[PDB]
Design a protein around this ligand. Sequence first.
Ligand SMILES: C[C@]12CCC(=O)C[C@@H]1CC[C@@H]1[C@@H]2CC[C@]2(C)[C@@H](O)CC[C@@H]12
Length: 243
Amino acid sequence: PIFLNVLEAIEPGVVCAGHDNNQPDSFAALLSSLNELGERQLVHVVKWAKALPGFRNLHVDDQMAVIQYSWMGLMVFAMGWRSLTNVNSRMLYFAPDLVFNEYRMHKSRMYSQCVRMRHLSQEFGWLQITPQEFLCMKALLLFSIIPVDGLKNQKFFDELRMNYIKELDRIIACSCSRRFYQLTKLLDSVQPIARELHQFTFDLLIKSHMVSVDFPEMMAEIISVQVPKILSGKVKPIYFHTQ
Ligand SMILES: C[C@]12CCC(=O)C[C@@H]1CC[C@@H]1[C@@H]2CC[C@]2(C)[C@@H](O)CC[C@@H]12
């Protein structure tokens, strides 16, 4: 079981947001801390992705591209999983030091997006997703969003993506196809969520000075350079099933 050995070994550790929980729960304070969390998580997602089986067979530019497109989905998926194990069905465990109750979901002005992330977290429970299924699905998510113009070497990407589909299939097989149906629908459901957060974070960056929300350097860059390519349709998710 080489492949699963690898996925479990490279899985990133606990990451703290650096949030001072002693301050009043403001919009400005919550969102600056999520942005800080995003910056620190992006560091772990990079090292993780670079260590995945076959990842270096991608052209260097494509390596950087898929990470920059996929990070939001990847982080949301992992977060829902932490949430499942750590908190109740009504809260979102962004970090040990940044757990959203209903009040914070409201003050963040992200209530409706939070409701979707919670549903995602509950689906992991409802479907009884295993650690092994979780890890293979999360690897797949990295290879689930690409430019419509195609990548620098698209051929290598398509082959890598095929291998990770086959790995998820293997993990399932151990009816059988009903599980595969379920997992692919779950995977698809990530993308509309990421899309709403993309739109939210983009809007927030533009108004960020007016509302006193701080955006760290990598975040500022990625949200101004890469996110708008998603929002304008130059970069699109790959769905398993038609939307
Ligand atoms: C990826 C993060 C931070 C990491 C995580 O656990 C998921 C979470 C989802 C909401 C994101 C947040 C990073 C900062 C964003 C993009 C804010 O600007 C608005 C929505 C936030």
